[PDB]
Design a protein around this ligand. Structure first.
Ligand SMILES: Cn1c2c(c(=N)c3c1CCC3)CCC2
Ligand SMILES: Cn1c2c(c(=N)c3c1CCC3)CCC2
Length: 134
């Protein structure tokens, strides 16, 4: 179907909701009837994982500049639920709040963990928010 053997993709671990860089190694039937089998780029040793089509995307690397961020946008961004001031994983999220002074910028989003959602997370890496194609 939509993504091809050997295509570089992002794949979402449906347990934890985070997206990781991966490669399609095999495509089988069960687009909603397609199963992607992927390997994560720096972990050949961890084998192949089966993904539903909704948990695979082309690698979208279009940054949305600070000024263009808007409340209500569903975007891809970096968050760490266990240490919220630190670098974490990549998640889908809906921008919920945006605040700026001359010296400070704050961004809040409702982060999707697949299982639950996490409203108004404070997002630290406001200059690495990415667009979702869709
Ligand atoms: C947006 N992004 C994503 C992933 C990355 N490793 C990197 C970016 C940006 C740099 C590395 C995984 C899923 C989305
Ligand atoms: C670090 N990591 C983690 C998970 C992954 N699926 C992948 C990585 C790296 C690529 C795939 C689940 C929890 C942590």
């Amino acid at each position: 179907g939509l993504y091809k053997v050997n295509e570089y993709v992002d794949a979402r671990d449906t347990n934890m909701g985070a997206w990781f860089e991966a490669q399609v190694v095999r495509v089988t039937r069960k687009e909603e009837d397609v199963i992607y089998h992927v390997k994560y780029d720096d972990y050949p040793e961890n084998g192949v994982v089966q993904m539903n089509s909704r948990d695979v995307r082309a690698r979208a690397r279009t940054i949305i500049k600070w000024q263009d961020l808007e409340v209500g946008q569903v975007v891809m961004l970096n968050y760490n639920p266990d240490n919220p001031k630190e670098r974490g994983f990549w998640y889908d999220a809906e921008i919920s709040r945006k605040r700026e002074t001359r010296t400070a910028r704050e961004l809040y989003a409702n982060v999707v963990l697949g299982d639950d959602s996490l409203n108004d997370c404070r997002i630290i890496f406001v200059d690495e928010v990415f667009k979702i194609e869709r």
